Design a protein around this ligand. Structure first.
Ligand SMILES: C=C1C[C@@H]2CCCC(=O)C/C(C)=C\C=C\C(=O)O[C@H]([C@H](O)NC(=O)/C=C\C=C\C)C/C(C)=C/[C@H](C1)O2
Ligand SMILES: C=C1C[C@@H]2CCCC(=O)C/C(C)=C\C=C\C(=O)O[C@H]([C@H](O)NC(=O)/C=C\C=C\C)C/C(C)=C/[C@H](C1)O2
Ligand SMILES: Nc1nc2c(ncn2[C@@H]2O[C@H](COP(=O)(O)OP(=O)(O)OP(=O)(O)O)[C@@H](O)[C@H]2O)c(=O)[nH]1
Ligand SMILES: Nc1nc2c(ncn2[C@@H]2O[C@H](COP(=O)(O)OP(=O)(O)OP(=O)(O)O)[C@@H](O)[C@H]2O)c(=O)[nH]1
Ligand SMILES: Nc1nc2c(ncn2[C@@H]2O[C@H](COP(=O)(O)OP(=O)(O)O)[C@@H](O)[C@H]2O)c(=O)[nH]1
Ligand SMILES: Nc1nc2c(ncn2[C@@H]2O[C@H](COP(=O)(O)OP(=O)(O)O)[C@@H](O)[C@H]2O)c(=O)[nH]1
Ligand SMILES: [Mg+2]
Ligand SMILES: [Mg+2]
Lengths: 426, 426, 426, 426
C-alpha cells in the first residue's frame, strides 16, 4: 500500500486533525483505539490496532493534552503526540527559530522513524493556520527539513487563509506574509480556506444559525477526505497526489489552489432537491458555494479538478462538464486551454454522526486556481504593509532577531507573486 | 506546566490579593484549608499554574506577601486565607513607610526585599516553566507603589524573558486618597513603565459607578470592589488555566495587545454588568455580552473610552458560543464604531475564547482595551503632581529620605513622553 | 414532458396558488408532501416526492409564513418560498424599484435554477392582483427580467381586475394603471377577473349566501385547471400555451382576454338540469355567467376558446357551436371572421373536497376578447384620472422617485389602448 | 420580524399605556410576569412585534416609559405591569413640568431625553426590521404634550423612513382639564404635525358618552375609558400581529389613509358598542357591525362625522366573515350615505380583514375615519388659544421658560393653514 504522511501543526492544525481522524476511523470502521486499503494511512500492529500516519506538534501543550485525554488518545502513539512547554505566542521568530529549534529535531526523528515504517511513502499533509505562532513559524521550519530529508515526496500543506474581514489575532497579517514567503520554496501545493466564507456557507446552504470551530472543522475534514479517497479507495479514475501536483500547479510558484465542495445542504433541503451529477457540478461553480470569500467572477480559472464520490458515471460527468464549459460565464485563462482534469472517485462521501450535512449519494470536491486569488493577496499585502509602515508590534520580532528589510523583502516576494497572478491571467 | 507567580504589595495589594486568591480557589474547587475538593477534572487539570502541591491535597498558592506594615497580613491570615498561604511567604517588617515612596522602595523596603527575593527564588526553582509574576499594588499607596517597584526591578533582572505584570490601582481622578498620591504615582510609574511587560490601570471611582449604579449595589465596600478586580484577573488566566476553541496564552495576549514597547496599560472591561433585578429582562447572547463589553459604563478605569482611539482590544470570552456569532458580532461593532478604532491596525478587534464560564455565569467575557483615552489618567496624575511639585508640597518627607528633585523631574518627564506617544498614535 | 413555470405574486397570487396546487395534487392523486404527465408541473425527486414548478414571492412574510406552516409546506421547496421583510404597502414605486430590487435578484436565480431542472420549458403563469403593492410593482419588474432571460417562452399573467364598484384599497386605481402600463411590453397575455361579478355568480348560480376569498379562489383554480389540463392530460384537441397566444391575441398589445366557466351550479340544481354540451355552451354566453362584470352585449367578440372537459364529443360541440353562431345576439367583429378556436379536452373537470360546485360529467372554460372590455378601461382610466387630478396620495410615490408626467404618460398609454379597442371593433 | 416600538408620555400617556400593554398581554396569552402562557400558536406567532424574549418565556414589552414626574411610573410599576416592563426602560426625573410645554419639551425635558434616546437605540439595535414607534400622550398635559414632541423630533431624525405615530388626547371641546390646555395643544401640534406620520385624535368627553350612554356604564373611570383607547390601538396592530384574508400592514393602512401629507389625523371608530343588557336583542352581522361603525355615537373623538366629508375610511375587521358580505355592505353604506364622502376619491371605502377576533367578540371591527369634520376640534383649540393669547393669559410661565410670542404665533398660524387645507378639500 502506498501510504502518505500527515502532519498537524498548531491549535488549528490539531483541531482539524481531531475531526479528520475521527472521520477516517468512521470511513474504515475503525474503533477509537485503532481496533479493526486503510493501510495507506494506518499501520496495522500485532493486535489489529491500526495506528495513524500522523504527527501532532503543539508547543502549547494544552491542546494536545486535551487530545491525549480525549477518546482518540488510545489510537495515537504517545511518541506521535509531541508537546512542548510554551508556544510561540503568535511570533514567527520563535516558531521558526527561537523555540521551534527545540522540538523540530525531536519531531523529525519521529518522521524518519515513521518513514522507515513505510514502503510506499507518497505524500505528506501539514495542517495549520497562516498566523498562529505554532502553525506559522514552525511550519516553514519543518517544511524546509522535509524538503531536505524527502524532497521527492509530495509536500502538501493546509494553511487556513486569514478571513478577509474577520481576524482573531492582530498581527495575523504579519505572520501570514512571513510564513508564506518562507514556505514558498519548500511547499508543492498550499491550500487556503476562509473561515468567514465557510460561516456564510454553513448559514446559507446548511441553514446554520451560528457556526463554530466544531462543525466548521467537520466540513473541512470531509473535503480532505475526498482528496485522500482517491488514494484510499477504488475509483474509476484514481488520482495519486503526485498527479494533483502535476495538474494543479500551472507554474512553479503559483501553487495556491482553493477548493470547495458540494452538496452543502441540510437534510431538509435534500428532499426539495434532486442532486444529479449536473446539479452538483453547477453548484460547484456558484460564487455562493465559494469557500474562500473571493467571488470567482473576479478573475479567470487557471486550472480544475473534480473529485467525484459515490454514484457518478463517466458520461453524466462528461455531460455535466459539457454544460459547465458551455456556460461561458465561467471565464478561464487563454494560457490554459482545456485543462479541466477531473478526478472521479466511486466511493461515496460519508456523514459524521451528530453531523450537520445531508447524506447524499454523490458529491464532489471542486478545486481550482483562479487569477481572482490575487485579490486575497492584495488584502494581506496591504494589511501587512499598513502595520509595517508603523512598525506596529515590530519591537516584538526585531528583539527576537528578525531583520527590518527582511520583512520588506518578504512582502516584496508576495507582491511579485501577486504580479505573477496578473501575468498568468494575461 | 507554565507557572505564574504573584506578588502582593501594599494594603491595597494584599487586600485585593486576599479575595483574588479566594476566587481562584473557588474556580478550582479548592477549600479554605488548601485541600483540593473540586469535582470536574478541569478543576485541577492545570492547577499547577497557580498551585504547588505540598502533599496529599495540600495546594500552595504561588504567591508572596510583602509589606513593611505587619498588621495588613495579620488581618489577611486572620481571614479565610492564612492557612492556604504558607508562612514562608509572609515576608514583612514592622515599620510603615507611611505612604512614602522613598521609604517603601528606596530606603527601608530594600531590607525586606532581600528576604523576599530569596523566597522568589525558592518558588522559581520549584516551578517547571516559569511564566511570570503578577504583583498587586496601589499606584499611590506608599509601600504598594514603592516596594513593588523595587521588587520588579530586581526580579526582571533575574528573569528578563518572563512575563511580569502588575495590577496597580490608579488614583481616582476626582478624589485623592493620599495628599501626596500624585508623587507616589509619578515615581512608581517612572520605574514601573520601564521594568514591566504589562500594567493594569484601575480606578475605585469607576468601580463605584459600576457597583452602585450599574449593579445597583447598595453599599460598595472594598470586599465588593475587589470582587470586581479579582474578576478580570481570573479571566485572563483562563486562557492558561483551561482549554478553549481559541486558547490564547497570557504571553500571546500580551504580544497581541502591545503595538509598541511601553504602552502596556490596560483598562479591563467586564461582562455581563447588570443588577439582579434587571437580569430577567435581558438575554445573555454574544451581542448582549459584547454590547456590555463596549459600554463606557462597564469600563473599570475612570476614562471615557470614546476619547481618542482604541489601539487594541482583547475580547476574551468564557463559555460556549459560536465562532461566527462572536466574530460577526465583534465585526459589526468595529464597523459601527469605526470612528473609535486606530486606523493603523486593520481588524482592530482581537478575540479569544475559553470554553469554560466563570462561577455559574453561562456567558462571560472580559474586555481589555488599550485606548489613547487613557492619557487622561496620566494627565490627572501629571497635573496634580505638577502643582505640588512647583511649591515643593510635602517635599521634605521624600527629600528627607534622600530623593533628588531631578528624580521627580525625570519621573514626570517620562510620563510626559508617555502621553506624547499616546497623542502621536491618536 | 413539456413543463411550465408558475409564478405567484402578492397576497392574492399566493392565496390563489394555495388552492391551485391543492387542486393539482388532487387531480394527480398526489399527497400534500409531494408523495406519489404531472411532470409537466412537477419534478419527481428520488423518493416519489414530486415538487411543483412554482415560486412564491411575498415581501409581507406573514402570508407565505402561513403557507410554510400550512399542510402543503411539505410539498414546496424552502428555496421556492421566498419571503421578504416588509411589503410595498400598496406602493408601485417600492414594488418595482425601492424594495423589489432586493429580492428580485434572489427570485430570478431560483427561476434560472428551476429552468435548468427543465427540458421542455413552455410557459410561465404569474399570479397577482392589479393593485396590491407586492402584486403590482413587483410583477412588472419580474416580467421585464423574464422577458430578457427567456423571452421566447410564453408569458402568462393572472391579474385580478379591480372590481368596478368594489374596492379594498383607495389607491388601487393608481396601481393598476401604472402596473399595467409597464407590464404591457413584457406580457403575452393577461387575464382579468372581477371579484364582484364572481360574488354575483356564487350567489346566483351556486346559491351562495355570502362569498369570501376561500371559495372564490377554489372557483378560479378550476378555471386555470382546465387551461393547464390541455397540457397535463390527453385530449382530442390538445392545446399548447403557445397556441393560446397565437389565437387569443388578435393584435400585438390587446392581449387582455377575459374568461368564464360553466356549469357553475349547486349540486341541488344539477338534478333539475340536464347539462348537455349545448346546454353548457349556451350558458357560457349568458351575460349572467360573465365573470368580469362587463355585459358581453356592450360590444363585439374579437376572439374564442372552448376548453371542454369530460364527456364531450366533437359533433355535439360542433352542433353547439353551430347553435351559438346561429344565435345572432352574440355580436362579433367584422375584423375577425370565423375565429372561434375551440379547444376540447377529454379529461373531466374535478371537484374540491368540501367544495361548493356540482360534480358534472362535462364542463367548459369559455375565453374571449370583446370590445366591451373598453368599458373596464374607461372606468379605471377615469378613476385614476380623478385622483391624479387631485394628486390624492401623489406625495407618496413622488417621494419614492416617481415622476409627474410619468403617471400622465402611463395613463395616456392606457387611453391609447382603450382607443385601440375602439379601432378593432370598427 | 417587523418590530414596533412604543413610547409612553405623560400621566395620560403612561396610564393609557398601562392598560394597553395589559390588553395586548391578554391578546397573546402573556401572564403578568412577562412569561408567555397562551395556548394557540398564533398567540406568540408574531409576538416579536411587541415583545423581546429575554429568556425562557421572558417577554419584554418593546416600550419606553418617559416622565419628569416620578410618581406616575411609580404607580404603574406598583400595578400589574412593573415586572413586565424592564427597569432599563423607566426613564424618569424628579421634577414636574407642571403642565408647562416649555418645560417638559424645551427646557428640562431635554435632560431626560438624552437617556431616553439611548434606550431607544438599544431597542432599535435589538430589533430586526424596525417598523416604527407608538407614543402615548395628552395633547394638553404638559409633559405628555411637550416631552413627547421633543422625543419625536429626535427619533424621526434618526429613523426618518420609519412609521412613527402618536396617540394624543385632544382637549374636550366643552370642558378644559388644564386652564392653559389650549397652549399645550397648539404648541405640541405645531411640532407634532410636521414630525409624525400619524396622529390619533381622541376626546374623553366623547368617550364618556360612549361609556355611560351607549354602553350604559354606571361609573366611567379612566380604567374603563382607557379600555376603549387600548381597544382601537390593538385592532390596528392585528393587521401585523395576525394573518387574515386581507392582511393590511400598518404602513399599508397609513399609505391608504393619508391622501395628502400632514392630514394624518384620525378618529377611531368602534364596533360593536352596546351595553350587556341590549346585546341579546341584536345579532352581530357585518351589516350590524358596519351600522355600528357608521354611527356618530360610536365616534370616539368629539366630532359629528356628518359635518363635511370623509376623505378616507379604513374599516378593519376582526373575525371570520364573507368578503362579499363585507364589500357589499360597505358599498351599500357608501351609496346611501354618499353625501358624506369626498367626491375626490372614487370608492371612498377602504377595508381590511384579519381572521382573528379580539377578546371573545366573534365579530369586531375598528373604524378609522378621516373626515373634514375634524376641523372643529382644531377650531376648539384655536379659538380658546386665541382668546388667551390676546390677553397673554398665563404667558409668564411659558415666556418664563424662554418661549417666544412668535413661537405661539407661528404655532396657531400652522393650525390655521391646517384647517384651511381641510376646508379646501371639504
Ligand atoms: C470574575 C468574576 C467572579 C466574581 C465572583 C464574586 C462573587 C461574590 O462573592 C458575590 C456573588 C456570589 C455574586 C456577585 C456577582 C456580581 O457582582 O455580578 C456582576 C454584575 O452585577 N452582574 C451582571 O451585571 C450580570 C448580568 C448583566 C446583564 C445585563 C459582575 C461581576 C463583577 C462578576 C464577577 C465575575 O463575580
Ligand atoms: C379592544 C378591545 C378590548 C377591550 C377589553 C377590555 C375588557 C375589560 O377589561 C372589561 C371587559 C372584560 C369587557 C368590556 C367590554 C366592553 O367595554 O365592551 C364594549 C361595548 O360595551 N360592547 C358592545 O357594545 C358590544 C355589543 C354591541 C352590540 C350592539 C366595547 C369595547 C370597548 C370593547 C373592547 C375591545 O374591550
Ligand atoms: N478552521 C479552524 N480555524 C481555527 C481553529 N482554531 C483556531 N483557528 C484559526 O487559527 C488562527 C489562530 O491560530 P491558532 O492555530 O489557534 O494558534 P497556534 O497555531 O496554536 O499558534 P500560537 O498559539 O500563536 O503559538 C485564527 O485564524 C483562527 O481563526 C479551528 O478549530 N478551526
Ligand atoms: N380573488 C382574490 N382576491 C384577493 C385575495 N386577497 C386579496 N385579493 C385582492 O387583491 C387586492 C389587494 O392586493 P393584495 O394581493 O392583498 O396585496 P399585496 O399583493 O400583498 O400587496 P401589498 O400588501 O400592498 O404590498 C384587492 O383587489 C383584493 O380584492 C384573495 O384571496 N382572492
Ligand atoms: N481597590 C482597593 N483599593 C484600595 C483598598 N485599600 C486601599 N486602597 C487604595 O489604595 C490607596 C492607599 O494605599 P495603601 O495600599 O493603603 O497604602 P500602602 O499600605 O502604603 O501600600 C488609596 O488610593 C486607596 O483608594 C482596597 O481594599 N481595594
Ligand atoms: N384618557 C385619559 N386621559 C387622561 C388620563 N389622565 C389624564 N388625562 C387627560 O390628560 C390631560 C392632563 O394631562 P396629564 O397627562 O395629567 O399631564 P402631564 O403629566 O403633564 O403629561 C387632561 O386633558 C386629562 O383629561 C387618563 O387616565 N386617561
Ligand atoms: Mg494554540
Ligand atoms: Mg399582502
Amino acid at each position: 500500500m502506498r501510504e502518505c504522511i500527515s502532519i498537524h501543526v498548531g491549535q488549528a492544525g490539531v483541531q482539524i486533525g481531531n475531526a479528520c481522524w475521527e472521520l477516517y476511523c468512521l470511513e474504515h470502521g475503525i474503533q477509537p483505539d485503532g481496533q479493526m486499503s486503510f493501510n495507506t494511512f494506518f499501520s496495522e500492529t500485532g493486535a489489529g490496532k491500526h495506528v495513524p500516519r500522523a504527527v501532532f506538534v503543539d508547543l502549547e501543550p494544552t491542546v494536545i493534552d486535551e487530545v491525549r485525554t480525549g477518546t482518540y488518545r488510545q489510537l495515537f502513539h504517545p511518541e506521535q503526540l509531541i508537546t512542548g512547554k510554551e508556544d510561540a505566542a503568535n511570533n514567527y521568530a520563535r516558531g521558526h527559530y527561537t523555540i521551534g529549534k527545540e522540538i523540530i529535531d525531536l519531531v523529525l526523528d519521529r518522521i524518519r522513524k515513521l518513514a522507515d515504517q513505510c514502503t510506499g511513502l507518497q505524500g505528506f499533509l501539514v495542517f495549520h493556520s497562516f498566523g498562529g505562532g505554532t502553525g506559522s513559524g514552525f511550519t516553514s521550519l519543518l517544511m524546509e527539513r522535509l524538503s531536505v530529508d524527502y524532497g521527492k515526496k509530495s509536500k502538501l500543506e493546509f494553511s487556513i487563509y486569514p478571513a478577509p474581514q474577520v481576524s482573531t489575532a492582530v498581527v495575523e497579517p504579519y505572520n501570514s506574509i512571513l510564513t508564506t514567503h518562507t514556505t514558498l520554496e519548500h511547499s508543492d501545493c498550499a491550500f487556503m480556506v476562509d473561515n468567514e466564507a465557510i460561516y456564510d456557507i454553513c448559514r446559507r446552504n446548511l441553514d446554520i444559525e451560528r457556526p463554530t470551530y466544531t462543525n466548521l472543522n467537520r466540513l473541512i475534514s470531509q473535503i480532505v477526505s475526498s482528496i485522500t479517497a482517491s488514494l484510499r479507495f477504488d475509483g474509476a479514475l484514481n488520482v495519486d497526489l503526485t498527479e494533483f501536483q502535476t495538474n494543479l500547479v500551472p507554474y512553479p510558484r503559483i501553487h495556491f489552489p482553493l477548493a470547495t465542495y458540494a452538496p452543502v445542504i441540510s437534510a431538509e433541503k435534500a428532499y426539495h432537491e434532486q442532486l444529479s451529477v449536473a446539479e452538483i457540478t453547477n453548484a460547484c461553480f456558484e460564487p455562493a458555494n465559494q469557500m474562500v470569500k473571493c467571488d470567482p467572477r473576479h478573475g479567470k480559472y487557471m486550472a480544475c479538478c473534480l473529485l467525484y464520490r459515490g454514484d457518478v458515471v463517466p458520461k453524466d460527468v462528461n455531460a455535466a462538464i459539457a454544460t459547465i464549459k458551455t456556460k461561458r460565464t465561467i471565464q478561464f485563462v487563454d494560457w490554459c486551454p482545456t485543462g479541466f482534469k477531473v478526478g472521479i472517485n466511486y466511493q461515496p462521501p460519508t456523514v459524521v454522526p451528530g453531523g450537520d450535512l445531508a447524506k447524499v449519494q454523490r458529491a464532489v470536491c471542486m478545486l481550482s486556481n483562479t487569477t481572482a486569488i490575487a485579490e486575497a493577496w492584495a488584502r494581506l499585502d496591504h494589511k501587512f504593509d499598513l502595520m509595517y509602515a508603523k512598525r506596529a508590534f515590530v519591537h516584538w520580532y526585531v528583539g527576537e532577531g528578525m531583520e527590518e528589510g527582511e520583512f520588506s523583502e518578504a512582502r516584496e516576494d508576495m507582491a511579485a507573486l501577486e504580479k505573477d497572478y496578473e501575468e498568468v491571467g494575461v | 506546566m507554565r507557572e505564574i507567580v504573584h506578588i502582593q504589595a501594599g494594603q491595597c495589594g494584599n487586600q485585593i490579593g486576599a479575595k483574588f486568591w479566594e476566587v481562584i480557589s473557588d474556580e478550582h474547587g479548592i477549600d479554605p484549608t488548601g485541600s483540593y475538593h473540586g469535582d470536574s477534572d478541569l478543576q485541577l487539570e492545570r492547577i499547577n499554574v497557580y498551585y504547588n502541591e505540598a502533599a496529599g491535597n495540600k495546594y500552595v498558592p504561588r504567591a508572596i506577601l510583602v509589606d513593611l506594615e505587619p498588621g495588613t497580613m495579620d488581618s489577611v491570615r486572620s481571614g479565610p486565607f492564612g492557612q492556604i498561604f504558607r508562612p514562608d511567604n509572609f515576608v514583612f517588617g514592622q515599620s510603615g513607610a507611611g505612604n512614602n515612596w522613598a521609604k517603601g522602595h528606596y530606603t527601608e523596603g530594600a531590607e525586606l526585599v532581600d528576604s523576599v527575593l530569596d523566597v522568589v527564588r525558592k518558588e522559581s526553582e520549584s516551578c517547571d516553566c516559569l511564566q511570570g509574576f503578577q504583583l498587586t499594588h496601589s499606584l499611590g499607596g506608599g509601600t504598594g507603589s514603592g516596594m513593588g517597584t523595587l521588587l520588579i526591578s530586581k526580579i526582571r533582572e533575574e528573569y528578563p524573558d518572563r512575563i511580569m505584570n502588575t495590577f496597580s490601582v490608579v488614583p481616582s481622578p476626582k478624589v485623592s486618597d493620599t495628599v501626596v498620591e500624585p508623587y507616589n504615582a509619578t515615581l512608581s510609574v517612572h520605574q514601573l513603565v520601564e521594568n514591566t511587560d504589562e500594567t493594569y490601570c484601575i480606578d475605585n471611582e469607576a468601580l463605584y459607578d459600576i457597583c452602585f449604579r450599574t449593579l445597583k449595589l447598595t453599599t460598595p465596600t472594598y470586599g465588593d470592589l475587589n470582587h470586581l478586580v479579582s474578576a478580570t484577573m481570573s479571566g485572563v488566566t483562563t486562557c492558561l488555566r483551561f482549554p478553549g476553541q481559541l486558547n490564547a496564552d497570557l504571553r500571546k495576549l500580551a504580544v497581541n495587545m502591545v503595538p509598541f514597547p511601553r504602552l502596556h496599560f490596560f483598562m479591563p472591561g467586564f461582562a455581563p454588568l447588570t443588577s439582579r433585578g434587571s437580569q430577567q429582562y435581558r438575554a445573555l447572547t454574544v451581542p448582549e455580552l459584547t454590547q456590555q463589553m463596549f459600554d463606557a459604563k462597564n469600563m473599570m478605569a475612570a476614562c471615557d473610552p470614546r476619547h481618542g482611539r482604541y489601539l487594541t482590544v482583547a475580547a476574551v470570552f468564557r463559555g460556549r458560543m459560536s465562532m461566527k456569532e462572536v466574530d460577526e458580532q465583534m465585526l459589526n461593532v468595529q464597523n459601527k464604531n469605526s470612528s473609535y478604532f486606530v486606523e493603523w491596525i486593520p481588524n482592530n478587534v482581537k478575540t479569544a475564547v475559553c470554553d469554560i464560564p466563570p462561577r455559574g455565569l453561562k456567558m462571560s467575557a472580559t474586555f481589555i482595551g488599550n485606548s489613547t483615552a487613557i492619557q487622561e489618567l496620566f494627565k490627572r496624575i501629571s497635573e496634580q503632581f505638577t502643582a505640588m511639585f512647583r511649591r515643593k508640597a510635602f517635599l521634605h518627607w521624600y527629600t528627607g529620605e534622600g530623593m533628588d528633585e531631578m528624580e521627580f523631574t525625570e519621573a514626570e518627564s517620562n510620563m510626559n513622553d508617555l502621553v506624547s506617544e499616546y497623542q502621536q498614535y491618536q
